[PDB]
Amino acid sequence: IFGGQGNIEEYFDELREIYTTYPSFVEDLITSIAELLQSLAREWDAVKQYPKGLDILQWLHNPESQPDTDYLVSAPVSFPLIGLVQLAHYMITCKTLGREPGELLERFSGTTGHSQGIVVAAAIATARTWDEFATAAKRAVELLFWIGLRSQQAYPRTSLAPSTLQDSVENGEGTPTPMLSIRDLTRSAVQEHIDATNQHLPEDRHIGISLVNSARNFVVTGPPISLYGLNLRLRKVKAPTGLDQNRIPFTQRKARFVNRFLPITAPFHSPYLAGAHAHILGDVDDMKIPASSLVIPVYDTKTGQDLRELGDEDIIPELVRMITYDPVNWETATVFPDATHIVDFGPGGVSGIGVLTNRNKDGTGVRVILAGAIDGTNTEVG
């Protein structure tokens, strides 16, 4: 299982953990995948969206030269740099085992990722050599680079009112983005409020459900200003953390939910990344990932169905679609049939999708292990 952008503003902190701890194992593809991106950064289209530059080796050596937490989280730098930490994890797992990428690759049953991960989840099921590895590594990394870059070019950050800004911050939420979290609510409910909001809006700026991480966990997209208009409606229904309801009839109580903005920099899984899709495809036809080069099953994002059931069609022109236009119906693509263990290589210590999913499947007896960290604050995950 492979994570993604999930309240991760410290992804580059994980890279330092990697670099520091396992130098021998990783330093080589760290060096090279760096210089890959450095060259990508200079291509005329990418210069604008990479103002402070892309020199991962530099920030790692002289920490005081690391860009601001805001820079790193932006899609262009977020995506690829993150994949690198997911690779270096898989790389370190196999390497410490004493095996090759095809060995540990064969001791699995299936693999999926949370949006930004389904790239690395597919391309990791392509490698068997350490040579055949560093091949798909340059492939995935550069794919991410363009997906993030071209997505930000389609729907870029437009500053909102300082007023409506501060409102969000003070009212429990955060700095308005196009990605809104809505935990502890029902789909039926979450929709109805999305419906009323969309009612008074122009079709240009409607609201969508972009992911479904569980029965009671959602994410919503649309323009930031449009998402805000939802939150306003939302707080008028929800109850203060102060209120006591231990003395009120149950079907009488107000709803106990959390709404909040996420550090995601662009409208993914929405009709808003339409124009970008074409662009991304064109940069990446030099490479092609056929359904047949898939060692272990890669389960689709929107439906659980294996990608190997494709007629050698580029998983590339499909990875792009699942990420930039398609819902992520995570809990269905996660229904790993009869499983005992699931391994989170994804980004974020006790925050990676491993914890989320471990909840999705606590009853069934699925154990979870977070490969990224040695120990954390959670005792429900190894």
């Binding site: 604008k48 437009t158 500053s159 909102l160 009112a161 300082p162 700026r205 323009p223 200003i225």
Partner: protein, 762 residues
Amino acid sequence: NAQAVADFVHAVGNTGEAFVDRGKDFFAPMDFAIVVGWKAITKPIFPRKIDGDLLKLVHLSNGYRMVPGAEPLKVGDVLDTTAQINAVINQDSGKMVEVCGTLKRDGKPVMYVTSQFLYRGVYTDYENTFQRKDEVPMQLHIATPQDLAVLRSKEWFKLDDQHDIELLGQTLVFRLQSLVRFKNKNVYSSVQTIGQVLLELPTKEIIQVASVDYEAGESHGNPVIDYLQRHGSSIEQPVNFENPIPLSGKTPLELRAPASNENYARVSGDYNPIHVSRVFSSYANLPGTITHGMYTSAAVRSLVETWAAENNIGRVRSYHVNMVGMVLPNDAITVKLEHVGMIAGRKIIKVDARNKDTDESVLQGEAEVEQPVTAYVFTGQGSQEQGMGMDLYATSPVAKEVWDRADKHFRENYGFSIIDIVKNNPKELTVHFGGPRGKIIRQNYMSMTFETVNADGSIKTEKIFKEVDENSTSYTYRSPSGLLSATQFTQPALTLMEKASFEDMRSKGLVQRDSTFAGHSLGEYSALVALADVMPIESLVSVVFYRGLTMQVAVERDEQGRSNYAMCAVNPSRISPTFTEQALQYVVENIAEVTGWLLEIVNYNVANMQYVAAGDLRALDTLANVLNILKMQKIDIQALMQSMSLEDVRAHLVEIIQECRKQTEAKPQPVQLERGFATIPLRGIDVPFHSTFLRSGVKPFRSFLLKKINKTTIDPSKLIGKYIPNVTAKPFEISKEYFEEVHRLTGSPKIANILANWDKYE
């Protein structure tokens, strides 16, 4: 170019959803004017007589200013760039050139980009230094033959052969232009002043009563302006506060001059070696690679947009900066924004940008941003409090004069003072038709016409003051509750307090050019005169004083005072949550033609919560009943419109109507209507106004309005799309389709006749 735009934006730093395609707006920065007109703005620097080192030049000042009403720059635009040299004078720092650019689009000027450049160094080519200033509009008040005699005695004052309107009483407007040529930075080698002397008529006419022509050489000052500065005052000026309102706060806005100036140089057109190369700038003695003058400007100007105009570019109608800080690349710049003033409904905004390390000023200028979407609404009768707006009377020389012109009228014409009536409320007041000035007053009391036609079709024209003839010494008004209670007085009072109050804000400069205005009942009249010059204030009070009179004479009463009709409020929320607006109409419209009396919803206030009906005492007693039934009967007219057809609940109503009807009929003849469930009668209303009843007296009141309003005085432009009437709940429009919405509701014989000719009006 759709692209050229986004290139500029992504360079300087602005990121407004107007600058980008999404949202319902796509617009270009007005900073683009300097990119577009970069030709016209630059070329004038070159000529032979203005010759200096273009290398040692610097961009000194730059102001944009958008013509009134003109929408901002869009992409599919075609712009014609015109410029001329407004002044070239050699200050100490160097020699300076003032460039006035005008960006036209579709033959019409959209925004003027002025700009100053500095050929820095030592210059004595005073041979070619000069300036065209537009002299401050000034207001000279002639008051004595002495004053006038001097204003004529002047050489430069040239009176015109228009009309010989005595310039004695009135005041004059002096809008002048002038050209000065320098010789010493201290002594003008030669100066010329041309201008136009204006007078406003009582009718609001603007005439060029004369003009100004003066010229002299070797002058130390402007003798024309000087004369004006003393005997008169400036006008149309800013209005700042004692307390400058911080906008961003003490959380200082922070900017950074980017690393490579090239980024800008490209999207601007100014490749000037100063900002990019090392050796070029080094030759001109600079701190080196100086950040773009205009870049700094455009950057802070974005904050001004998002921070004051809050995202709606249209608002920011002006921006002007003096750059004084040479910003090096990668500097931290610090911006502060205050709301230091107001001009013509526009917020003035002081802007200040400084070097975050040495607090040396970088930028300094003001921005005339527009204030948020407003709507002014003037209240109706009922809220009249004793002494209202009298505190403001004392504290405002503006509001003062209003009330005065009003009183001045009333006293000398109707023989009373509304100010008195307002200050201390008389339960009774009498006027006296004394000597010369007294006989003329009863004349007006006599000349008060009142219309009511016979049931056979003959127009009765009757006196309002029946007891006034030419043997009458005095008339007396009365009211046990105070004269500020009966409308003839009540109305003109409320009108005044509002007109005054508003005219004051106008004076501080708070009134918005582009906003809505409406009134309720009376408020509509004041409203009009408030924002549109529908009529002079004496006309206004007259009109409204008449309105109150005809409103009171409409109804009939007996000796005890006992009136025939009465009004009453209704809350459909207190019957059933199903009960529609249309449900209340149906209950009423039915009771109307069923029991044969008079009854109609007169007021439509809140969608569910506030309605008001007038009519017969019994018609308010049968409608009082029916709702008590339907409230305590727990009905649902939605479930009863699917169960029973329209005739079934309609014939079901004609039941409860006649029932509740004859119960009110056998009860006493003057029905003292009382508080029901939603039926709370309005205490103090004789006349069923805002109903079909007063249709009768619509005839005289119109012909009176035509006496009081003058076609000449009216600006279509003012009510064209801003004024919301009470008959037409949608914005007053002049279209032929509107007269149909009006005629449908009203049946104006002047409208049918002016709708028939519609072609005639091309």
